Amino acid sequence: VEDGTGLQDELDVVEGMQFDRGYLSPYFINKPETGAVELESPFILLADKKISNIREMLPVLEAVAKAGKPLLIIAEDVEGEALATLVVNTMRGIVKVAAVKAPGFGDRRKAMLQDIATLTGGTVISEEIGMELEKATLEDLGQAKRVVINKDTTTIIDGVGEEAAIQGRVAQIRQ
């Protein structure tokens, strides 16, 4: 419960997966106002580390570019070098890609990352595990109908994933 603007009580209901993280590149707005990003049938990428000159991981991006589908990126941070080429790429039409910061705190964001990936069918890139920046095929990336992004929030309409994985993630939560 929160304080309302009016003299009247109001209820808000959220469907699907949504989080309180904004978009690093304000410049990429897919269609609507408010800085909204709407990616249709996007591929979702999750990583445990930041991207700077470390842009190399491009074959992952290119595979998506080859596909012709939008890319959603979740990681600790993204720097202007990747964003600079990316903003041009999205504007020029090569790829429609926007990146958003992962949750909040060390354990908190990465614990939270596996469910996002599993929900969308994707695989989290584990720096931690036998995985690397350019080591990961397009198939690794998760899928969703579309996403909605604004300055302070990221939303996924529906990731494509199986019930056994959705429920299993919820089941492991019981401990």
Partner: protein, 97 residues
Amino acid sequence: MNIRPLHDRVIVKRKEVETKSAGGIVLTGSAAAKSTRGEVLAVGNGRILENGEVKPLDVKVGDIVIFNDGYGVKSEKIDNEEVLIMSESDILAIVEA
């Protein structure tokens, strides 16, 4: 007008930097990156070392070469376009056919 290199010096011009095709379909804007490829604008008389005769350079004018952008690479303003000046030694390889 143009310049005539002073023996063992090769005048070359640098090719395009961070050519749009890195990593794949990805187009990348040029930021803090540079290219080692170039064209041979001119050929010096030859190397003058060891006094006996002047050895001809192994690079032809108009060749496409690969070189090390090192200490011995000099930046010159000729007419109004960028040129590079280095010895035969600084040019590592030739892109031929």
